[PDB]
């Protein structure tokens, strides 16, 4: 986990930088850890999701909606992130919030037209994230939970706007996924464990939508101890790795 000794860090790094890389649990560089997801458990919300990882990292996402004038509210999708044990003022929380807001920007994050009701009114989507537990960078965790929540989100059906009392339409949209990668030496790792993230030379946040490597893309320090520079071919490796191993995450998440 976090706060490993120098000996532990050296061992882990040597295993993770060797060719091929030896991950502490024997995972392949592109292999994810077992997670499970539940949806539709919050009746009051339009959508809902809960994701649990094998290391204990647990996240909860709620999808709510409200009618707004486009003209007065140009942003039809707002992401609010609440991490337990972290104040709303915290740097990492606002960073994640900004990032997620950009991945999901109505501009080109998702298709804004799917939200439109009338030429003057639409549904604003409130995505509320509650990170119960996290031992690594929760950006992918949150992203996946949001994906699941949006793919199981139902909205009131239109018939000033008036709505059907009992019938609701499934929100149809292709939600984006955000991936996190660990750069260790000359090796790229998907779904980095806490101990892996403690010794990683750097990190790559790579967004993904409709089967394309989309923005935002970030380089992110997974720690402060071993942050080193990296060669561009590694960045290319990460991108290729995502676009190679993303459609299976998409088909795994979208099969219900």
């Amino acid at each position: 986990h976090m706060s490993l000794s120098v000996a532990e860090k050296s061992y882990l790094y040597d295993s993770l930088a060797s060719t091929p890389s030896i991950r502490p649990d024997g995972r392949l560089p592109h292999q994810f850890r077992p997670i499970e997801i539940f949806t539709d458990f919050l009746p009051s919300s339009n959508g809902s999701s809960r994701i649990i990882a094998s290391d204990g990292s647990e996240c909860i996402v709620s999808i709510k909606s409200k009618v707004v004038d486009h003209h007065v509210e140009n942003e039809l999708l707002q992401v609010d992130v609440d991490i337990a044990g972290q104040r709303d003022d915290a740097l990492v929380v606002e960073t994640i919030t900004s990032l997620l807001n950009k991945v999901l920007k109505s501009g080109s994050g998702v298709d804004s037209s799917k939200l439109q009701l009338t030429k003057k009114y639409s549904f604003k989507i409130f995505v509320d994230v509650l990170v119960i537990s996290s031992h690594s960078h929760p950006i992918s965790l949150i992203s996946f939970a949001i994906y699941s929540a949006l793919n199981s989100t139902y909205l009131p059906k239109l018939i000033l706007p008036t709505f059907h009392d009992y019938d609701m339409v499934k929100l149809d949209i292709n939600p984006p996924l955000v991936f996190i990668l660990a750069v260790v030496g000359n090796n790229m790792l998907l779904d980095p464990a806490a101990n892996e993230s403690e010794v990683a030379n750097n990190g790559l946040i790579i967004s993904w939508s409709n089967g394309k490597i989309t923005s935002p893309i970030r380089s992110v320090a997974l720690n402060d101890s071993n942050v080193k520079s990296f060669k561009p071919h590694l960045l290319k490796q990460g991108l290729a790795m995502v676009e190679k191993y993303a459609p299976d995450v998409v088909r795994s998440l979208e099969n219900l």
Binding site: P161, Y166, M168
Partner: protein, 223 residues
């Protein structure tokens, strides 16, 4: 999905969408189902046992006559189950001392009448409150009884569900009172039932004409 509970109880989730002016808000409530709702008939033997007292420790009075007004076949031993419209149009006839002696007022009808006309709802509540030897009006919470509660199908307006609930109420009534032979007559003006696997369904004027004192009250009805 519904959950069974400790003492003949149940719960489901009534979900719908309120449309306050200029907005949409989905509302979720818990709807409990029960097995102790009394038919309030003097003829029923089973219900007085499963019944429980109120907050004042009071066991609701069974007031519906053991021997109601009896008509010509295929109607004997009949109780009257009203529809919202019939109440709205013939409320002043429902108050007439010489007709409608034994009337069942479904909860859902009470609610509909309340929504469309509060004074008429008050007069109906007055009828159910001041029930005596001369007139007998009861309220039956069909929505809270699992025996009678119907759940809304998709792509179906509220009206179909309401009338299907009244229909199920009448059906449970017929099945419940038949060991004594009390029939129930669903009086309505809205072309409710296309022949299905039943219940006596007569319009207002039809029910009036089946009455002994028809000539007295035939003209106490809006045209």
């Amino acid at each position: 999905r519904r959950k069974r509970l400790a003492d003949g109880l149940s719960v489901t989730q009534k979900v719908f969408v309120r449309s306050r002016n200029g907005g949409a808000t989905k509302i979720v409530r818990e709807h409990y189902l029960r097995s102790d709702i009394p038919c309030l008939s003097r003829s029923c033997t089973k219900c007085p046992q499963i019944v429980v007292p109120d907050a004042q420790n009071e066991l609701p009075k069974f007031i519906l006559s053991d021997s109601p007004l009896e008509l010509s076949a295929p109607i004997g031993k009949h109780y009257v189950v009203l529809d919202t419209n019939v109440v709205l149009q013939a409320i002043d006839l429902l108050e007439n001392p010489n007709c409608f002696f034994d009337v069942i007022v479904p909860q859902i009808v009470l609610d509909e009448v309340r929504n469309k006309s509060y004074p008429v709802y008050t007069r109906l509540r007055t009828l159910c409150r001041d029930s005596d030897d001369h007139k007998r009006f009861i309220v039956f919470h069909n929505e809270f009884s699992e025996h009678t509660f119907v759940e809304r199908l998709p792509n179906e307006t509220i009206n179909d569900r309401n009338n299907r609930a009244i229909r199920k109420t009448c059906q449970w009534y017929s099945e419940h009172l038949k060991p004594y032979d009390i029939n129930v007559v669903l009086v309505t003006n809205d072309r409710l039932n296309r022949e299905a696997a039943n219940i006596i369904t007569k319009s207002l004027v039809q029910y009036i004409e089946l009455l002994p004192n028809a000539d007295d009250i035939r003209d106490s009805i809006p045209q």
